[PDB]
Design a protein around this ligand. Structure first.
Ligand SMILES: CC(C)CCC[C@@H](C)[C@H]1CC[C@H]2[C@@H]3CC=C4C[C@@H](OC(=O)CCC(=O)O)CC[C@]4(C)[C@H]3CC[C@]12C
Ligand SMILES: O=C(O)CCCCCC[C@H]1C(=O)NC(=O)N1CC[C@@H](O)C1CCCCC1
Ligand SMILES: *[C@@H]1O[C@H](CO)[C@@H](O)[C@H](O)[C@H]1NC(C)=O
Lengths: 59, 339, 236, 307, 128
């Protein structure tokens, strides 16, 4: 019983600090992830394949 | 009873969190997308096959030069490869044969590994007039080691099967910080691009965001419905992806504090063992128990490719820092480099 | 490019030295058989360890007829086994130790449930289990003269009879013969339901004073290897 | 009167037809092609030591039939004996025919001994098998056996034996009878068949040792789509042992009968027909090899005739 | 968020009857095998019964065979345990347990202490 109430006291305190945070809209967060991918699309060799002369694994 | 009152207050606080997340869910990631061009068909070929392990491979980790690779197998061996030439650079025999994880230091001077012996062993690769030796053994975990990642040459963070995470001072061998709060075996950890935060996934179907310099849990994410096996940060550090036993990958946003996307198919009924992102974050690569690796479009959640070359379970996955190639380890004792 | 050619020559020589060492390690690896020792503390698992002869795992090495065996015992892990038990999918056999006298908490039903999950796990479908029903002398006391009963925990024991092919021990009461073979048939019901010819169960009755279990592990492992070799002749 | 009538003849003797020599090739071609068709589906996905040994045996059985049979069938069609079949090649066609016929008999016997040794070691000494028998060793059986068989069967080319043409003139083989009893001619004929006798004896003993372990394995399991059990593996080993012994002894008996019985009490008409049946019996091993080792193990065949 | 909530327990005379319910949420209920486990006031956690994904595969522990009946309702995501002829030995805290993974024949740690996919339980007391 002592270990049960001790665990429940820490569960309440953890939920208090997680409830009082500032959150942004999902649309704002989705637009940031989408804008990150389009600004680095040309730098992704798996997305845009490099020429065979620039590929170190092509023999 | 006082125990009943705490359960009621905890249940009240969970409803406040759920309403706050629902208040900021004005749109979905699919609606913001669905006007952008799809990825297309991603067709990668095997460029290298690495042979020499005698038993199943459990982990691999790329070096920061995107050329050297370390892998761990349960034949009690740790092999460092040169992926450009397929030459073996080092072969470290391990004291315990049950290794479950391995790591490569960003400086390239050290390699760590651990497993069922509840010890994280550090190996010095730059020994003056000698071979590779054990620099340090880190003891203090009461469960099996599941993951480890270097912060620098003197700090490393580990996951364990005793529902805890720890931060170590390698020079003194002592736990600087203990991260507690999970109620199941922690299976994976992923460091942020700036080594101030990390995320962990455990067998309680939840993921937690930790602050390294304060040792506290900031956010908890409860999207999955089974054990989480893998976790990986987005390249910008504002999101991460998880893989679970419910045959589903999910994407979580830190600032929105909720799940964004689910990556699943009707004919996929096997768990996910490893996840990783491409350099830009557009692709999400996941290793599965049906011996395959699926390439997902992270923004549109439609499968773009399949990596099918292993005869047994795919256990580990890794993308280079320059984004040139991916590496897959498997239970058939082979590593492949795809491009 | 003289230095570039020399450093690849030096890298090729270092790869040759590693491959020679990995040939010696391959011969040792396939000449050694690995076993997992699984069981509760009360079951007499530690008594089996001395018969064969903080830390996360313990290892015992013994040799029977110039054949090396490495047995591993789980030392410091939590009771949730569903993650770390996948590491033992390629062992030659799993040694499962059961306290046959612990039938009245129901430790016998707990051992039956653990055996069911091991037998039906998807990563353990090709791993054979050597089953040791331990402490037959303790079972002998509680059945013949003791008032302890097994029908209350297992109602099917009333209809059960000794099989005709069963061989009672010399100087053994018939009543304790039914007790031993009823517990054995509980495990054989699980194993024969979904064996499918991939893995097999080898049940044995054992005691602390036996000192013959090391030979019985050798004989069962020989049969396990023979049936693994037989699967290569159905080549299509 | 020389013992071998057709050693200089230039035509096929009256009273012979290619039906018997055409049936053996026709049945042996369809059996071995089907077996290689099944091996391609499984191995290439359109391996064990036994898979490597079986492929080497099937390749030898297919090469032997496709290389010897058209020469025999051409003789019957053109009404010309084996030494005037190719006038640009003269009698070298008969010498090469006899060399290859003895090579395929010796090579396939040595391969069947290695397949009997492999099955006896894996079931009789499983711990010894795991330490020392590897996939590299199983891939080196057919090359090393063929290299030895090519060198051993070339001893008459070095002056230790003879090759002669047999009636009706459509085949050539080792000379087994010498009128003067020369030790040069008769020494190799006895040495070849004595070696073949020891290989057949060792193959039978190894198959009996493997079948003894299979019965013991079935006996333990009795105490307690569909995969092959122990007894149908024992059934296939028993069938192979009976046919391999039955089809190999006529050749061995002719070599000893031709070296230790005086020529004057032998007749000639009966000896011609008996030497022919000995090599027609030896040809049946290649016909039944694909069925015992490949086709009867296929799940595709087991659908039609379950057993 | 995987949640299991039990209800239906209470004080019952010997030979009486009780029906327990387990409302499930946060997962696909039809993909998992469900279990009932209990903890006596002195002993540890003990497995009681289980039922497969579609029903039709039911097992009990020996002491409750012929008296307990486990039932499933995939439409309502509810697990049931009908209890008949209750004994004083049945006094326990009964928990609703879920197997760790979907589409699996085996269930490993449902009786382990601190298992994540188990509910808070309900108290059943049998006394005259
Ligand atoms: C002159 C022409 C008309 C006839 C050629 C005669 C030989 C040169 C041939 C006939 C038999 C052949 C052998 C028959 C079987 C095999 C097994 C074969 O191996 C396999 O098929 C699978 C096993 C493995 O790959 O090791 C390797 C070639 C080899 C030795 C062949 C090598 C070439 C041989 C000796
Ligand atoms: O002269 C006549 O009428 C028939 C001549 C008798 C020889 C048959 C030749 C040919 C044929 O005609 N049919 C086959 O199958 N052949 C090929 C057999 C061949 O695989 C075998 C291998 C083992 C060693 C011995 C030969
Ligand atoms: C065949 O010719 C040889 C000489 O080439 C001769 O010695 C031999 O007796 C002849 N055999 C016959 C005619 O049967």
């Amino acid at each position: 019983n002592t270990a049960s109430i001790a665990q429940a006291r820490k569960l309440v305190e953890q939920l208090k600090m997680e409830a009082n945070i500032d959150r942004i809209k999902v649309s704002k967060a989705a637009a940031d992830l989408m804008a990150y991918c389009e600004a680095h699309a040309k730098e992704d060799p798996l997305l845009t394949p490099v020429p065979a002369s620039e590929n170190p694994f092509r023999e | 009873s006082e125990l009943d009152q705490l359960r009621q207050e905890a249940e009240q606080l969970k409803n406040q969190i759920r309403d706050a997340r629902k208040a900021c869910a004005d749109a979905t990631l699919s609606q913001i997308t669905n006007n952008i061009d799809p990825v297309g068909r991603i067709q990668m070929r095997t460029r290298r096959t690495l042979r020499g392990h005698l038993a199943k491979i459990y982990a691999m980790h790329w070096g920061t030069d995107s050329r050297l690779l370390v892998s761990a197998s349960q034949d009690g061996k740790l092999i460092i490869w040169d992926s450009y030439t397929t030459n073996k650079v080092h072969a470290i025999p391990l004291r315990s044969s049950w290794v479950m994880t391995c790591a490569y230091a960003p400086s390239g001077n050290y390699v760590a590994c651990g497993g069922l012996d509840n010890i994280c062993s550090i190996y010095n690769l730059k020994t003056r007039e000698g071979n590779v030796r054990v620099s340090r053994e880190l003891a203090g975990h009461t469960g099996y080691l599941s993951c480890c990642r270097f912060l620098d040459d003197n700090q490393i963070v580990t996951s364990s099967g005793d529902t805890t995470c720890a931060l170590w001072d390698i020079e003194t061998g002592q736990q600087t910080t203990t991260f507690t709060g999970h109620t199941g075996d922690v299976m994976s950890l992923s460091l942020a691009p700036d080594t101030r935060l990390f995320v962990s996934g455990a067998c309680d179907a939840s993921a937690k965001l930790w602050d390294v310099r304060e040792g506290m849990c900031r956010q908890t994410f409860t999207g999955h419905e089974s054990d989480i096996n893998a976790i990986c940060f987005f390249p910008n550090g504002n999101a991460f992806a998880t893989g679970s036993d419910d045959a589903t990958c999910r994407l979580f946003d830190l600032r929105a504090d909720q799940e964004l996307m689910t990556y699943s198919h009707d004919n996929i009924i096997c768990g996910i063992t490893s996840v990783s992102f491409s350099k830009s974050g557009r692709l999400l690569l996941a290793g599965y128990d049906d011996f395959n690796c699926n390439v997902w479009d992270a923004l549109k959640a439609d499968r773009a490719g399949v990596l099918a070359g292993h005869d047994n379970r795919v256990s580990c996955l890794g993308v280079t820092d320059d984004g040139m190639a991916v590496a897959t380890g498997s239970w058939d004792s082979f590593l492949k480099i795809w491009n | 490019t003289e230095d570039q050619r020399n450093e690849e020559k030096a890298q090729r020589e270092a790869n040759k030295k590693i491959e020679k060492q990995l040939q010696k390690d391959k011969q040792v690896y396939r000449a050694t058989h690995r076993l997992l020792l699984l069981g509760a503390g009360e079951s007499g698992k530690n008594t089996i360890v001395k018969q064969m002869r903080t830390s996360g795992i313990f290892e015992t090495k013994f040799q029977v007829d110039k054949v090396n065996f490495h047995m591993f015992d789980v030392g410091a892990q939590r009771d949730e086994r569903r993650k770390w038990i996948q590491c033992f999918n390629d062992v030659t056999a799993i040694i499962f130790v059961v306290a046959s006298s612990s039938y009245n908490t129901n430790r016998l039903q707990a051992a039956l449930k653990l055996f069911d999950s091991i037998w039906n796990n998807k990563w353990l479908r090709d791993t054979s289990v050597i089953l040791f029903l331990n402490k037959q002398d303790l079972l002998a006391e509680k059945v013949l003269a003791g008032k302890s009963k097994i029908e209350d925990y297992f109602p099917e024991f009333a209809r059960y009879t000794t099989p005709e092919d069963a061989t009672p021990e010399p100087g053994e009461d018939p009543r304790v013969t039914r007790a031993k073979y009823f517990i054995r048939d509980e495990f054989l019901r699980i194993s024969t339901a979904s064996g499918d010819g991939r893995h097999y169960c080898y049940p044995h009755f054992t005691c602390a004073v036996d000192t013959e279990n090391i030979r019985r592990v050798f004989n069962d492992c020989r049969d396990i290897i023979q049936r693994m070799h037989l699967r290569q002749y159905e080549l299509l | 009167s020389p013992f071998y009538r057709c050693q200089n003849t230039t035509s096929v003797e009256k009273g012979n037809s290619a039906v018997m020599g055409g049936v053996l090739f026709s049945t042996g071609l369809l059996g071995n092609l089907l077996a290689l068709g099944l091996l391609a589906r499984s191995g290439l996905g359109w391996p064990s030591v036994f898979y490597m040994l079986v492929c080497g045996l099937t390749v030898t059985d297919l090469l032997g039939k496709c290389l010897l049979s058209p020469v025999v069938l051409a003789a019957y069609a053109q009404n010309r004996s084996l030494r005037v079949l190719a006038p640009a090649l003269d009698n070298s066609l008969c010498q090469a025919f006899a060399f290859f016929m003895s090579f395929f008999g010796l090579s396939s016997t040595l391969q069947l001994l290695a397949m009997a040794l492999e099955c006896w070691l894996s079931l009789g000494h499983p711990f010894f098998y795991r330490r020392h028998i590897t996939l590299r060793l199983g891939a080196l059986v057919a090359p090393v056996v063929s290299a030895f068989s090519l060198a051993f069967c070339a001893l008459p080319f070095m002056g230790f034996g003879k090759f002669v043409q047999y009636c009706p003139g459509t085949w050539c083989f080792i000379q087994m009878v010498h009128e003067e009893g020369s030790l040069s001619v008769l020494g190799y004929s006895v040495l070849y068949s004595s070696l073949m006798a020891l290989l057949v004896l060792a193959t039978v003993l190894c198959n009996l040792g493997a079948m003894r372990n299979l019965y013991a394995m079935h006996r333990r399991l009795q105490r307690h789509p569909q995969p092959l059990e122990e007894l149908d593996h024992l059934l296939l080993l028993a069938l192979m042992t009976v046919l391999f012994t039955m089809c190999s002894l006529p050749v061995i008996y002719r070599a000893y009968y031709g070296a230790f019985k005086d020529v004057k009490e032998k007749n000639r008409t009966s000896e011609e027909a008996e030497d022919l049946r000995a090599l027609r019996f030896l040809s049946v091993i290649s016909i039944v090899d694909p069925w015992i080792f490949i086709i009867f193990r296929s799940p595709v065949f087991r659908i039609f005739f379950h057993k | 968020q995987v949640q299991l909530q039990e209800s239906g327990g209470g004080l019952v005379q010997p030979g009486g009857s009780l029906r327990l319910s387990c409302a499930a949420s946060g997962f696909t209920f039809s993909n998992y095998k469900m279990n009932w486990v209990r903890q006596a006031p002195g002993k540890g956690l003990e497995w009681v019964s289980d039922i497969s994904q579609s029903g039709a595969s039911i097992s009990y522990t020996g002491s409750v065979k012929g008296r307990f009946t486990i039932s499933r309702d995939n439409a309502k995501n509810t697990l049931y345990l009908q209890m008949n002829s209750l004994k004083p030995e049945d006094t326990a805290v009964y928990y609703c347990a879920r197997c760790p993974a979907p589409f699996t024949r085996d269930c490993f740690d449902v009786t382990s202490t601190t298992y994540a996919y188990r509910g808070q339980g309900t108290q059943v007391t049998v006394s005259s």
